[PDB]
Amino acid sequence: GKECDCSSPENPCCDAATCKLRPGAQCGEGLCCEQCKFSRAGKICRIARGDWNDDRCTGQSADCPRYH
């Protein structure tokens, strides 16, 4: 059970007591969080080096994950 959508308690987007988005904001902190909203998928959230696939937001994700 996750009750903290954010790690910073001083964040206004996510309630401090419930560490979660209080309003209709999608995310309080993240690379795909534009205006506390989910940016769009296919977003180069991270650029890899070498010869693989860069990191692209999934549209419904806020924290850009990794692959290699």
Q: What angle do CA 58, 6, 4 make, to 5 degrees?
A: 110
Structure tokens at 48: 């890899």
Cβ burial, residue 25 (10 Å; 0-12/13-18/19+): middle
Helix (H, G, I), strand (E, B) or coil at 44: strand
Domain count, the chain: 1
Q: 28 CB contacts (<8 Å, ≥6 apart)?
A: 5, 6, 8, 11, 13, 14, 20, 21, 36
Structure tokens at 33: 């969080």
36: containing domain: 1-68
CATH at residue 28:
4.10.70.10
- Backbone dihedral angles phi then psi of residue 14, each to the nearest 5 degrees: -100, 130
- 40 within 8 A of 14, measured Cβ to Cβ: no
- Cα–Cα separations (whole angstroms), residue 18 to 28, 29, 36, 37: 12, 15, 16, 18
Note the helical H segments in 1-68. Answer: none
Distance between CA 51 and CA 33 in Å, rounded? 27
Distance between CA 25 and CA 1 in Å, rounded? 20
